[PDB]
Amino acid sequence: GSMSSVFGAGCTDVCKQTPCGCATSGCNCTDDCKCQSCKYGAGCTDTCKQTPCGCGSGCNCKEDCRCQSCSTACKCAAGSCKCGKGCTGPDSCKCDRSCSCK
């Protein structure tokens, strides 16, 4: 129940590479980047990618995490998701822990 995208809202051509070059040439993408490959390392942990997630109440991520399973519930509610997504809730949120809302 989500958009089938591997990109965010402003990815570089380096992200459009193959393999993804952001892990070689640096990352410069947006907070919506659904690319588990470039933003990894400085955002996640080996406990998050376990699928669904092994973090839960025992997280070991960085901060650039886009998962709402281990990240704490946003204060988004009643139109309080100013990033522009407008999820207004952690369950609807698909942003990261350092986004505009959070």
Contact residues for Cd ion, defined by CB under 5 A: 11, 15, 20, 22, 27, 29, 33, 35, 38, 44, 48, 53, 55, 59, 61, 65, 67, 69-70, 74, 76, 81, 83, 85, 87, 93, 95, 99, 101-102
Residue 50 C-beta: closest distance to Cd ion, Å: 8
Residue 77 structure tokens: 């509610």
Residue 67 C-beta: closest distance to Cd ion, Å: 3
Distance CA 5, CA 56 (A): 25
Distance CA 46, CA 11 (A): 24
Nearer to Cd ion, 1 or 33 (CB): 33
Residue 90 C-beta: closest distance to Cd ion, Å: 7
Q: Omega of the bond prior to 90 within 30 degrees of 0, cis?
A: no
Distance CA 62, CA 6 (A): 21
Half-sphere exposure of 83 (CA within 13 A, CB side): 24
Residue 18 C-beta: closest distance to Cd ion, Å: 10
Nearer to Cd ion, 38 or 72 (CB): 38
